[PDB]
Amino acid sequence: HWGYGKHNGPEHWHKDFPIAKGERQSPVDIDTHTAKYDPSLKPLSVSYDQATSLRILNNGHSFQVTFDDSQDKAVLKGGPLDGTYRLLQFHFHWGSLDGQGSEHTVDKKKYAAELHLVHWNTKYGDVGKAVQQPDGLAVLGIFLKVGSAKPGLQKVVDVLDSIKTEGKSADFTNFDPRGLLPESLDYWTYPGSLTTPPLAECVTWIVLKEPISVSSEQVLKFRKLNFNGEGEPEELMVDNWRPAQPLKNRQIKASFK
Ligand SMILES: NS(=O)(=O)c1ccc(O)c(NC(=O)NCCc2ccccn2)c1
Numbered sequence: 001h002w003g004y005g006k007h008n009g010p011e012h013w014h015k016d017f018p019i020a021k022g023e024r025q026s027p028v029d030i031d032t033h034t035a036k037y038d039p040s041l042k043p044l045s046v047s048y049d050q051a052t053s054l055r056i057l058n059n060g061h062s063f064q065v066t067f068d069d070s071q072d073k074a075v076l077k078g079g080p081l082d083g084t085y086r087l088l089q090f091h092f093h094w095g096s097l098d099g100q101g102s103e104h105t106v107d108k109k110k111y112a113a114e115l116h117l118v119h120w121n122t123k124y125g126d127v128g129k130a131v132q133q134p135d136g137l138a139v140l141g142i143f144l145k146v147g148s149a150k151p152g153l154q155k156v157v158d159v160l161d162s163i164k165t166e167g168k169s170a171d172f173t174n175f176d177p178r179g180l181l182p183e184s185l186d187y188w189t190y191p192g193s194l195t196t197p198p199l200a201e202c203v204t205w206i207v208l209k210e211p212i213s214v215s216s217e218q219v220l221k222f223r224k225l226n227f228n229g230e231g232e233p234e235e236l237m238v239d240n241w242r243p244a245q246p247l248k249n250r251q252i253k254a255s256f257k
Pocket residue numbers: 116118139193194195196197198199203
């Protein structure tokens with residue numbers, strides 16, 4: 001089974017998921033001087049006021065907060081998108097040290113972590129159908145750097161000790177994901193893929209230029225999670241990121257100058 005170790009990590013994934021070598025894989029390095037400003041791109045519309053968080057889960061590859069996606073409660077619209085995308089979950093990728101952890105890079109710079117807010121296109125009715133479509137998902141990616149604390153992350157950090165090992169979950173209601181967003185919604189966008197198996201080429205990526213800052217204490221709590229299940233040899237959940245993949249026949253567009 002796939003993971004992030006020497007014998008099951010990203011360089012092995014293509015054996016079970018041959019699309020790993022496909023034409024629109026993620027993440028990628030964002031070369032800021034080569035991204036082209038597109039004046040036709042609209043502002044992103046992030047409408048999270050009615051979000052209903054449900055549960056937080058350690059799935060053995062990250063921790064995920066899930067939302068009620070049975071109605072248009074927390075939706076992403078505008079930007080490069082046509083139609084309405086419902087928020088299903090968010091999760092993070094992070095490093096063993098502050099100089100690595102992000103999936104996307106910016107002029108080869110790696111951030112300490114990366115937040116993925118995962119949304120699916122309501123025209124396909126459910127996320128399983130959306131993953132089989134080239135415009136099925138929109139993932140809003142937000143970089144994390146280490147410095148000052150992010151107060152809106154603290155409720156997440158404080159429950160992680162209850163989901164230490166793979167398969168554990170907890171009720172996580174009334175969490176407001178607006179507390180995770182930076183000031184600016186300036187973004188880069190490109191067509192890509194899921195960054196974990198099945199690596200489906202179904203994602204419009206929207207990566208925010210402005211990182212959020214989190215404290216060293218907050219990221220240390222991420223690094224105390226375990227990849228293993230309870231009772232198995234402890235392997236800290238760190239470095240759960242896929243490296244940048246070939247850009248191939250794609251242009252990254254910027255919403256800003
Ligand atoms: N990391 S990401 O590109 O935001 C992203 C977003 C939504 C997703 O469903 C995934 N992939 C994911 O959750 N995979 C779960 C594990 C799995 C599911 C199906 C087959 C093999 N492995 C990644």
